[PDB]
Assembly symmetry: C5
Homo-oligomer: 311 residues x 5
Amino acid sequence: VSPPPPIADEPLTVNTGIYLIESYSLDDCAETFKVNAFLSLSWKDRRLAFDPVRSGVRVKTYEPEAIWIPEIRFVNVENARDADVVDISVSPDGTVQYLERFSARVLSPLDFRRYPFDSQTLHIYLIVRSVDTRNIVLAVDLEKVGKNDDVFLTGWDIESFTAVVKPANFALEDRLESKLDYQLRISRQYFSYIPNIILPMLFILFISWTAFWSTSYEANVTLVVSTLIAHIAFNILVETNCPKTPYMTYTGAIIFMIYLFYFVAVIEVTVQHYLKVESQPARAASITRASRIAFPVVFLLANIILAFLFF
Amino acid sequence: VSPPPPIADEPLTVNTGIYLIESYSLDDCAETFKVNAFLSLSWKDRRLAFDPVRSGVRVKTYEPEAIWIPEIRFVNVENARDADVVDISVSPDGTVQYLERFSARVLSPLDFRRYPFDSQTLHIYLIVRSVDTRNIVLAVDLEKVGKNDDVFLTGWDIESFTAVVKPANFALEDRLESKLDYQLRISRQYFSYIPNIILPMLFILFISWTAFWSTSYEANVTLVVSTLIAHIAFNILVETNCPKTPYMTYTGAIIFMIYLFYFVAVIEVTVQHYLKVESQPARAASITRASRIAFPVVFLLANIILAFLFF
Amino acid sequence: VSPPPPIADEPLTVNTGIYLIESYSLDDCAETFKVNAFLSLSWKDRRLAFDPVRSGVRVKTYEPEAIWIPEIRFVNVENARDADVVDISVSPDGTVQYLERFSARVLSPLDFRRYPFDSQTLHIYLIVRSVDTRNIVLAVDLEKVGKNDDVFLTGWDIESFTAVVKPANFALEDRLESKLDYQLRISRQYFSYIPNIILPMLFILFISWTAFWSTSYEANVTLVVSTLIAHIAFNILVETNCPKTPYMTYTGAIIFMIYLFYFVAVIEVTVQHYLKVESQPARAASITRASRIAFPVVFLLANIILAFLFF
Amino acid sequence: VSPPPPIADEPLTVNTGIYLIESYSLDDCAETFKVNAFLSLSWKDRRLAFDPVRSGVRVKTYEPEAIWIPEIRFVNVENARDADVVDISVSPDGTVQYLERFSARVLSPLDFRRYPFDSQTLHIYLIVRSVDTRNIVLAVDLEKVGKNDDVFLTGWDIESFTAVVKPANFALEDRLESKLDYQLRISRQYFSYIPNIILPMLFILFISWTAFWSTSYEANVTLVVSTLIAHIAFNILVETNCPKTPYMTYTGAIIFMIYLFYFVAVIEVTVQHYLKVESQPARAASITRASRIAFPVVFLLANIILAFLFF
Amino acid sequence: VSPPPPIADEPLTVNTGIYLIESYSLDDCAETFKVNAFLSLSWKDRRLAFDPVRSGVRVKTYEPEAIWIPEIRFVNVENARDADVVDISVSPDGTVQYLERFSARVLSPLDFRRYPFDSQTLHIYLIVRSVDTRNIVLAVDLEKVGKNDDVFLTGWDIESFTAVVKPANFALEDRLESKLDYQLRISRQYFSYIPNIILPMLFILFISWTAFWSTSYEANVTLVVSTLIAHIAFNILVETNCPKTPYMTYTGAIIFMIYLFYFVAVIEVTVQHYLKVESQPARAASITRASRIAFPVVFLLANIILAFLFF
Ligand SMILES: [Cl-]
Ligand SMILES: [Cl-]
Ligand SMILES: [Cl-]
Ligand SMILES: [Cl-]
Ligand SMILES: [Cl-]
Ligand code: NA
């Protein structure tokens, strides 16, 4: 089999559609997600045309091997998609209706800057390479683009599944490629992060601030250091959940800034003790009394500034 | 091969049955489980009919390629099922009896709200897409739906395996699709969670309450902070075991509430020390004495409340 | 190809044999193990009979596709076995000698009650489904059942590999099934658990009991809490190694009971301090002196009871 | 099919090109990366030559099985590449133009000496084995070597993708082989390591130095020991991120040297206490006062020497 | 196709050779390694013989399906090798020269007794089973056994790749099996273990010994218990790197023995405090003074004994 010939010099229009059946495995570290969907292809092959009155059959059904099917591939897949042809139907005028069910691991980058209050636009790129005989061009049949209502992605809210109707036609290795952009819009469900990471992290910090109502250096040292470790435990836990970035993330900024607070609290605790030993507890008392107000305020204002910069 | 033609205008009824041989790999985080079962299919194809007298056989055995077999797929599978045809039998009246043994990774959401005292309904959705020639509809042959007695799912009690007899018929890309719902009812074996997570977590909490019978700030600080840390160790362990959720879980609520108890115990320990230093140990004594009763009671009442809200 | 015909009304006897080449990957959490073995099959197909005079050769060699082969499957495999036909030999009378080399992940439950002093019986179930023409029945050729001397399973002692000679014939989905039980007997190598988990865990426990020869509440609180924490560290480690169970395990019982010891040691340490503060160190001295003897004994006695209940 | 025959005694020149579509999964521990690219091959096969006049076609398309294709393999792949033929075009002189899309896991060693400030040269080796008929030699068509602009590798900056134009021709198992070296130049994005590992690690060390402004042995012991533990937590985190090497890495050297600082700080803390107990706090005061300056300087100096040796 | 017939009653000699292209993924816990190599097979088939002068062609090239190839398998592979035939060449005399490129996961046990100063002998066993017609016997063509210079195995030094020239001929399931032993000799690169595990572990132990120059029970309890904890962290870390063994390993012995040192240090710290409280600090002073010398010596002597027993 060879491609359908052009009537006039026109490129072949392959109408495409992706219908999500399942979405799963959004790997933050790998910046990948798995998808199970219908891929619909539609193109006119005049060689396949027939008479409905005399043939008595409105639609003719073919096996993939029997006819010419355009070689459609995904740009951003890890391995080539696992596909199973559902149906091939030919209308009397020779319009072909291809339908396959596929599953693929899609590689699409994520912006972690606003984590865990981030939204993402996942991409699925369809592509066709033009043949020497004729040029192939992709189009979106919006009728055949959608998703099942039950499509869920654990820890995410699925906003929309749409296609950018205008293909990106360009030359690659002295031939035309026609690229389509399917978009899955999702927003992270930040709920869990509040009682699991954010609040426990704030409690340990506040516990270290009780050192401002204590004169016991040994006690204070213990408070600050111990709380500090725990901060370390949470900080590390996050790095694991997260992917390394060449930029700062929201949570990353909060976590880093909290380290400075522990460092300064240690300084205060050290200073207060030094003065007490040097028999000048009145200076020490002033610093400790200032610290009781300053820390919460600065910590609080600093957070405000950060949230402003990030949102 | 093409589908059996309709006598009158009727849709084709494909009788289905799933018999579980093996159940395994219930991944809580992935919300998936693996299954190994028999899939039985039965439909009438008049073109295949014969006379037992003329033929000298009361049954006819075909190879998949030889006859028309309905394209049955699973909706909620990760990848398309691994299937091996066991047998295809034809009765003299053109009644086809298809049997395959398959294995598949089924994606079915879980409700973690009552963890680890939760029960789940796992779903296996069978589907058939109608062809241009005729409409296909699924039915349940309850005689061919079951499970082996030895079917086990590690850390779960297998309640039942049943099918919702009435299919969910609907349009998808202008073709009728017949969807069937097979249900595997399971309930979690919470036993382990008592000596592994629940009791150790209560012991560390109770140990922090011994600070209410001590005047040593340094000793008290150590008691609360250390225990808090251990609680942190346990709190983190759970999140690894359990998926991030946009709702609170039972264990999650208990764990979060316990953080508040440590926070308040630190406040009490701080308050008691402050008064002792300000040469007013009679006030301190009252608060500490109140704390000894108040803590256990409030803790206990709060759990009662939570259990009420969750069950 | 169809099944061979009966010469009287008899069922077809398929003689089986499994010879283990390799056993590996015993996953305790998954309750699975991987196996690499020879599967030998023998049945008689009179339709394949030949005169060595005419054919030239005393034994004929066929390709699987060329002749009828009984559909033998494994019941308890995760996915269908990876098999490669080593040889298919036919003797003049039509006796077929089938040899394949396969590899499979077998799902077989484990009893953790006596961990790490447990022994297991791993099962490999062979099965055949009878056809409408004739009934198929499995048999064990004990001459072809065995294992290589070099067969090892990391962290386990391989006791025996035997077959239960009598098949389990039963009806399933209105057809007969002939099931065979191959057994791999193994016992855990508990050696490692002594210097890795058991002894370090006892040392930390005994370190806490040194609080019985101290009057320093602050030092005691450190000893008991710190050591307690370490126990926690070990406790979790086990849980990672082990599977959640609906029953208590030996190690699990020891670990849980040790928590009670820390809890009571904290009580003693609290009690002793309270009395010392209430200016009654003679009562405190009696309790501490009793504790020095009571603890080891009770701990010791308790272990005895536990070992008795478990073995 | 057999190889094209030599006109004169010349070896067959196969022109090659690799165009990266996707690069992902750079595993530091495994020293591997996954790639998805176009592989282009071009050679002259006179047997396939045709006259455009009598044929009426400027090009001819063939199925892989129909013609002779040189057996090109990758040297450094884990498993043989997953390839799909995109197009095979024959020009009138019999110049074959082959194009496949492949995906492969490439094994290429990494130099960790400058981690996380290291750059790497990833290699992809193309190879062809010469046949008994004629010698096969590889060449680079620089017009067909490149990468998509959107090619990204998480946590790395992609510098260049080039080919060493001159093949490495040599003998292997008594046949000549033509080897080509494709190079992917990348440099690590060290950004993250600063707020995640480097800075937290410096803060904990500096906190240990507050012991130089304290006379409380118990507070100092706690300060150093605790901080030391945190370092330990960070040290372990790294060796998990980072592969074991037979050489020292930059971060590894910093981490190891920091251990010496804790060890010496413990000695100082011990010495200072010993003197204080021996009723000679003037000596102790001198050592502590020296330590306040010495540590930062030595630490600071030590780093310069290290950074110098490593860069 | 059937096997080549014997001229005289001789068994068929299949000359073998394995040439390592790549060696990777040495999994200590799994006791496996992955290999990518050339497998060469050479045997003589008189049915395939031809005339050089008459034919004009020195060598004839066949497709695997066209001729008889001996069924060579690997004994110790997890799954059957992924093989791709590179070339089949027939000499006039009928000597066939087969060459495939394969990749396989080899299961070969490891001796951890001297870890991390251990050397291993990895095995690759080639096997052939005889047919009813004639007996097949393997031989090593040392000219075709080797490895690429660039073959590396992360964290290991590759010593040699050799073959035991004489096969192990034996009967299994009433047929001859000819087994060959290919050996990959490797020695572990212990460098990393010194600054990563060994030295940090010694530093924490020396820090515990500073308790011998302190009279502060509270400080000593902290020193010994904390450091002890750190030791635990390292001990556990090692357990993750290593596999459970039925024997003691070198590192395992060092780690276990170090626990005894902490246990005895706690006893000393307890004893010293008890005497101080009983108003007898002169006895306490003697024990502490003895301990300072004794611990290093015994620690040092015991280590010597251990190294002697292990090497
Ligand atoms: Cl694709
Ligand atoms: Cl399916
Ligand atoms: Cl099977
Ligand atoms: Cl390849
Ligand atoms: Cl093999
Ligand atoms: Na302390």
